[PDB]
């Protein structure tokens with residue numbers, strides 16, 4: 001029954017129409033799959049590993065983004081429609097599973113403040129498609145829980161500024177935040193990995209944000 | 212029968228075990244889908260569009276990479292195995308089609324020197340899975356042919372970039388670094404590039420497999 005060491009860490013981030021109290025919809029997602037050997041056996045800001053699998057997608061949310069969401073993320077439902085983006089459908093979930101199936105198991109999703117935002121919204125989106133157990137293979141970790149354990153604001157920018165004395169590029173974009181998260185997790189890569197291996201939680205224990 | 216204007220330009224690049232004369236196998240691929248409005252209505256080097264779909268994957272090739280291929284791409288079959296990479300299989304073909312199905316049609320693949328490398332290698336890999344017609348719906352353009360026509364001299368990705376932005380592009384000879392540099396080059400005269408693509412896009416079914 002216990003999984004043993006996580007073989008892949010899938011660094012994850014999403015943008016939405018708003019915050020959880022508004023019942024948000026995904027507008028953007030980024031998945032960055034990194035094998036555990038890139039963290040246990042790595043070769044001021046560490047370079048990302050040469051071998052990674054990346055997936056960044058924009059999603060039509062079916063409703064307006066709050067004006068706050070648009071200012072911070074640079075996305076709006078109207079601009080997403082101008083770009084011919086499709087909604088969060090069966091093909092999108094099939095795409096996500098196909099990408100994850102290319103990674104050796106056990107898989108662990110890693111998201112900054114993932115337990116309150118990215119993980120329940122991903123669960124809510126899948127549940128709305130009648131696929132409530134689609135990603136139940138996966139494990140998940142909140143990198144805030146992880147980085148507090150390894151050591152005040154625990155925001156992505158604050159943690160980044162304290163370790164590498166600079167602001168990260170392309171902030172508040174799903175891909176930019178995933179790349180910033182990776183660099184933060186590469187600060188003490190063996191320590192971060194041991195914690196993940198011991199505290200990875202089954203994705204099925206994540207309740208959907210709504211519905 | 213006329214497809215009309217291309218709605219998406221999918222900037223494409225691949226790394227392989229070696230050059231065509233060795234019957235190579237894909238080791239890495241990058242797809243960057245840009246809606247046509249990003250080039251027809253844009254807002255030194257131009258920034259990439261805010262809204263893009265990107266897929267970058269590494270692939271277990273089934274055989275050794277040539278020492279030349281490893282020196283240039285930074286990839287080897289042993290290192291791909293240590294990172295637990297899967298081969299080009301049915302799941303990889305469904306992943307590519309699901310990614311392309313998120314893009315409005317007509318789709319057009321854009322690869323630098325694509326006719327000789329990227330496009331026949333992709334057809335060869337799809338044919339080896341018994342999926343010869345999998346991407347017949349798509350169109351393709353070789354950006355070397357497009358940029359020669361736009362400038363009408365070395366026409367390598369590096370040389371074009373240096374002639375346009377007076378600097379060398381970062382992460383050269385990685386599928387993503389090269390897709391991004393090509394995107395920058397195509398954003399130089401985006402309206403003229405888009406007008407040419409619309410007039411000379413060719414159906415992907417006209418691309419024969421490199422081998423097989």
Ligand SMILES: CC(C)C[C@H](C(=O)NCc1ccc(Cl)c(Cl)c1)N1CC[C@@H](CCc2ccccc2)N2C[C@H](N)C[C@H]2C1=O
Pocket residue numbers: 013014015016017018019020024066068069070072073111112113114116117118121155172
């Ligand atoms: C106390 C702060 C520091 C919370 C911070 C935040 O408010 N930042 C500004 C902002 C960004 C985007 C939008 Cl849209 C807005 Cl309005 C405001 N947040 C919430 C937003 C979500 C992104 C949107 C979202 C909402 C619900 C579910 C999934 C995703 N991020 C994802 C990250 N991994 C963890 C979280 C975060 O840091």
Ligand SMILES: CC(C)C[C@H](C(=O)NCc1ccc(Cl)c(Cl)c1)N1CC[C@@H](CCc2ccccc2)N2C[C@H](N)C[C@H]2C1=O
Pocket residue numbers: 223224225226227228229230231235277279280281283284322323324325327328329332367384
């Ligand atoms: C005459 C020159 C200028 C060709 C140039 C080249 O020799 N560069 C060095 C090199 C890179 C990688 C490897 Cl592996 C080696 Cl050994 C050598 N090439 C071929 C390599 C392929 C990359 C691998 C490949 C091989 C067969 C089919 C698909 C892809 N590229 C992809 C690009 N879109 C167009 C082409 C390119 O410019």
Ligand SMILES: [K+]
Pocket residue numbers: 013014015172173174177
């Ligand atoms: K974010």
Ligand SMILES: [K+]
Pocket residue numbers: 224225226384385386389
């Ligand atoms: K290349």
